[PDB]
Structures are given as C-alpha cells and as structure tokens.
Amino acid sequence: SHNADLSEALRELRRELMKETGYSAFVVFTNATLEALAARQPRTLAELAEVPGLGEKRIEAYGERILDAINTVLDG
Structure with missing residues (x-):
C-alpha cells in the first residue's frame, strides 16, 4: 500500500x-x-x-485486473 509498491504492480x-x-x-x-x-x-x-x-471502456476491459493488482500488493 506503499505507493511505490502499488505503482510497480500497476506498471507490471x-x-x-x-x-x-x-x-x-x-x-x-x-x-x-x-x-x-x-x-x-x-x-x-x-x-x-x-x-x-480511466473511463468506462478500460473499467470493463481491465477493471478486475486492476483491482487484483492493487489487492495483491495490499494483502500479499
């Protein structure tokens, strides 16, 4: 939940x-x-x-993957 860790996961x-x-x-x-x-x-x-x-098109296409990236960092 450190910003750098989240940012890295999102770049990945x-x-x-x-x-x-x-x-x-x-x-x-x-x-x-x-x-x-x-x-x-x-x-x-x-x-x-x-x-x-971000916008609706990308929420539909990528939203679940984005939430999962964030959760992977926050929860480990």
Missing part, C-alpha cells in the same frame, strides 16, 4: 495488458491514471469509476 500489469492487446502503454492507461490508481487504491468497481482518466 500495464506491460501484461500491452502484450495481450498489442497496445502501447499510453493506450492501455496513462501515467496520470496510474498515479491516481496508486493514490486512490480503489477496491471496487464503484471506486474505479471515480478514477480520473
């Missing part, structure tokens, strides 16, 4: 999603969005919807 997730989709990091989600995820630590879909720059 973003690389997985890039490989799976063929998209750039930017198209997967931007650094401002990554930082907001790490700071806000959303734990639910409701909380994901509050994250600046």
Whole structure:
C-alpha cells in the first residue's frame, strides 16, 4: 500500500495488458491514471469509476485486473 509498491504492480500489469492487446502503454492507461490508481487504491468497481482518466471502456476491459493488482500488493 506503499505507493511505490502499488505503482510497480500497476506498471507490471500495464506491460501484461500491452502484450495481450498489442497496445502501447499510453493506450492501455496513462501515467496520470496510474498515479491516481496508486493514490486512490480503489477496491471496487464503484471506486474505479471515480478514477480520473480511466473511463468506462478500460473499467470493463481491465477493471478486475486492476483491482487484483492493487489487492495483491495490499494483502500479499
């Protein structure tokens, strides 16, 4: 739940999603969005919807993976 640990997991997730989709990091989600995820630590879909720059398309595509990345860091 340290910010650096969350940020690393989110960068690792973003690389997985890039490989799976063929998209750039930017198209997967931007650094401002990554930082907001790490700071806000959303734990639910409701909380994901509050994250600046993420948006519904990416919540649908990536939301569960994002929550799981955050939970993996917070819970171990």
